[PDB]
Amino acid sequence: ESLDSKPASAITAAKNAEVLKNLPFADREEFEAAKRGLIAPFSGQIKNAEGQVVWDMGAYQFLNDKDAADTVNPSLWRQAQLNNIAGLFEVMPKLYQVRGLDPANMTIIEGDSGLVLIDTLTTAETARAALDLYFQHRPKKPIVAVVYSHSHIDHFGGARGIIDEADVKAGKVKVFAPSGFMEHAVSENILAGTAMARRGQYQYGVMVPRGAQAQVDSGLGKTTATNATNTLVAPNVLIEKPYERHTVDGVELEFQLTLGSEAPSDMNIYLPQFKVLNTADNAPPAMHNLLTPRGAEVRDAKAWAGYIDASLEKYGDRTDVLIQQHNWPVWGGDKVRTYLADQRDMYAFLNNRALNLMNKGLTLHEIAAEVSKLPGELDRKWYLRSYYGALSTNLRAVYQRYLGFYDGNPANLDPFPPVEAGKRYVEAMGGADAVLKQMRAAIDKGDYRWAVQLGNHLVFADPANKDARALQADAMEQLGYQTENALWRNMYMTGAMELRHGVPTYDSRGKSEMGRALTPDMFFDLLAIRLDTDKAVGHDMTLNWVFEDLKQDIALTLRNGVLTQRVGSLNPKADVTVKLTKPTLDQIAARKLDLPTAIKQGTVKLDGDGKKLGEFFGLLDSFSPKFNIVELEH
Amino acid sequence: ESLDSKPASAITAAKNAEVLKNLPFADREEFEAAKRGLIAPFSGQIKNAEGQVVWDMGAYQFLNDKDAADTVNPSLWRQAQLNNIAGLFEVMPKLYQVRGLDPANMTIIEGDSGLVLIDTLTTAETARAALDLYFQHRPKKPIVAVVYSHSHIDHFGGARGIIDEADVKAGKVKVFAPSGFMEHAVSENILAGTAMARRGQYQYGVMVPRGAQAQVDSGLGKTTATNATNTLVAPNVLIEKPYERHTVDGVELEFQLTLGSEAPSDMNIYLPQFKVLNTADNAPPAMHNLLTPRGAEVRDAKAWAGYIDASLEKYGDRTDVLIQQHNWPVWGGDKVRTYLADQRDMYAFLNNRALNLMNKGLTLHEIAAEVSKLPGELDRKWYLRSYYGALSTNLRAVYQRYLGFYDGNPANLDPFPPVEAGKRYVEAMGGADAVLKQMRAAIDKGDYRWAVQLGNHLVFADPANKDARALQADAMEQLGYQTENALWRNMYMTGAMELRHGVPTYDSRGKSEMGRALTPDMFFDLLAIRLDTDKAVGHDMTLNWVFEDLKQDIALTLRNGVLTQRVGSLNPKADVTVKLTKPTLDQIAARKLDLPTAIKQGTVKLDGDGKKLGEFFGLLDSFSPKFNIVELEH
């Protein structure tokens, strides 16, 4: 049995051929929108300080000006080509977008004395790349204001690389965000972060080769940046009212809090002077995720559609062009009004149809099966295709949000873990060789869907079964070939790759400098997750922390192996008090500063049982960002 | 194959005998707390207008002063025995509680001139019955104020039976609520209502007969009311700040907002005069659900633990007795502080341990299997047992909250619907007879857990297979006999019953009057759900609605078979304009008033396409509330 990337099968290639028939020949239209406004194209490479490639558009050369392979769905192929159109873009004078040098875009407005920015890109390396391309056709000006459209890494991540941390702590540089920015940014990207990062490797297929048999696109971009630095710098102006007009450096900004939609903290941005609406990530030219593959809190389709409807109302007529922080803009008032209404109708449908079926008694997989397409004319639009988010996932995601993972059927109340259930299903079907045969029968029958369900149990029951991995991976690869959904493809490809070759060595949050923005309370929130309950039981203790610089007081309490904290108080009878400053912690947190060293320097002062601090730090786990996904631990 | 309720199996009874030894012997402590303050006991019946029974405590007589049967887990039997302690209780002079006439409790505070209430129970009938019992021992006074402690039907559903709609509308009776009450109460109980009510039939085993081989208790109560009226009356004063003091009828009320925890809209109530804390449903004497079986939004254990630690800090030192809106109070400051400390550690642990393992790479069923108990002394407390919420469910609920239903493994990206998967697995195992063989072997082995997974496949493949159904029911029954979890037992019993004798004809929301509180926007949010998209595809149209009494305008738009709405505006080019009143709408809504009848009456003015209004109402589906759960749909 082979561990090589197989070609498209008879059945795969045919399925893809059929798609050519079913796709509407209203082509070129969108291509015209992709290309319009282009100044300096980019098809090169971006490197970090050590010389490693962080972004590389050149690897996608194969998509360009060619027809679709059988190893790719034609619809996705098209979308993949569109995201290939990258570089520097003029919308209107004084208004620029840098596309295809990050999964995200960067919108820069040429202010009076300086510059106003919308979004910082994913990484400090891409951000400075973006600006570098800008300054190369436009005059050099400093940065007066930055706009975080949402609490998403691909937008706040490139921050520290283009703006100084202290100009924001002082106020010389104003930074605009949505309400509850910091609390949600740190949850998604830090508190469940190790899981999120690793699952994310599947979402964008980051370690998967770029080719027609492998990695082609990520729907709203190509993929993400590799071996680069995730930064985080907290905002100084928190927009908390539903609408707000602010003015800075001679630019008028109309903000629309779209909280709870695409991000838990998210806002749109309108520019009166230009007659332009920035929907951020709220209306991309592809169905978005209500539940992201990397893992996040479910999003609200209902609120999502209302916010789009609000945009359509409040700015629908006074807009000539709509620009987003992902993909190309849409030109002409008529077209934006139609676009937004279709976008609204989409998310509204997801919510309403799912809720319709729920009250009809359908369970999440039933619903996903029963709704095969968007209703009416929404089906025929290129910008509502399941390229990023899946109609199916999204329908399940509504059931999740309103009712949960449990389907109501007591037979699904307490499912067996994958290893347990695998072993039992294999036995039930006659053992390894019996299922292997059934797998082959299904791969020949071109039922790759069932083959993976079959193979999954087997690989989990016996991960040493080399013929099971090879088969499972082939079945997945085929599913990746057939799928319209750029994200699904990435996941099926990364699946196959890791079934075959194991888990590659790479940390998504290796270079990360996001722990700088962490307040002490967010830090101890992290330590609570880090703490090993089982070891910690028996070692009950209380710890006082006084942050002399921030004049902050936190009371940590470890009881029954559970860690809890009180911000703004101190326990009198605490076992130890730790007097220090934010930066001192910062270096203990990034492992720069040795425990016994710190006490000698005078940088950490102790009152009580010092051996308690040491023993408390001993009780912390560290998380490997390199865990198994398609086979069992470790 | 038999369809009768089977007795305990040798392994089941054995398992249940072992519980006796491992349960802590410090019984009686909890009984003394439940009995304390009892004035008037209740074991009676409560009946509706048509004389049907809505609530019967005497049905549980079998539990009283008797030892546990082999068909019920001893720990649960204890819990059941405590929930049998029902009636009117004095907490302190001027402070009374009505327990065990409803799944929830009623707190009654005697004021300067009238009565201050906390929660109104589930139904008009029970609520009236609670006040009867009170007035039978305390002086008849009017209700001056009501407090909705959270947006759960067991706390707001009985309001209309005891206070007047227009009195609240005017401001004579102050009704307090936590921020966003209406929004979340109408969402959970009306928008997703038919699903939630039916799934709720399982959660409380409503149609399951009460006895040792069937229904016995529901953790924080016995069950819910049957054949009763759910009401809803919108509050007039909303608590928006984290803490608020209010004095009404000479009663000092401190509110602590605890939004996101047990309920989206939720708060605690401190009574400084008394030195008592009402923790509503935030600290019941049992683990609570982070994800409820009936179905609702996931709950935030992190917040949950945080709010408790807040109560502990801000009220723990000035609290002599803690009272709850379910179960008995806890007496003694030292005891309440221990109690709240333990409860906080619990929800903190749930969140933190799950998140720990998540970052370690474990999936939801893996973490469920890995964590078998609460840590340290938390395991040893009666008030933290999984009687209501399950430890496994809650662990899975943390996974759901932060990551979602998808485990990251692409094999599980696109699962088959129950029927599809069932037919395939059955085939893969060698068809009905072969799987029935395997089922039989599993029941003999005492593997009731595996049996139900096996049988579910079969029953869904062919719901006419009476052996399958009968076996699956027996296995479900044993699982029910074994479980400590009141909710799970209910679910397993209801399932076994419906597998055997089908779904009985009962509407939980039969007498419901919750549509009366619905404002027009709410009513249209409901219609968009009710709308049949396939049908309404092709009938695109626009409707203006003007509410003469409310002075409110609503712009309905139906596009691509999807219904959206705009509040505060009218579209000038609408196919029709309707000018009416809220009462008028209600009567058409409750089906009491025909369409053409109303038009004639002058209560409904049309402006445009008259035919259109008719063709719009004929596009809405009706939900049957009797859908199958343990087998595929009708």
Ligand SMILES: [Zn+2]
């Ligand atoms: Zn985003």
Ligand SMILES: [Zn+2]
């Ligand atoms: Zn983005």
Ligand SMILES: [Zn+2]
């Ligand atoms: Zn509740």
Ligand SMILES: [Zn+2]
């Ligand atoms: Zn309750």
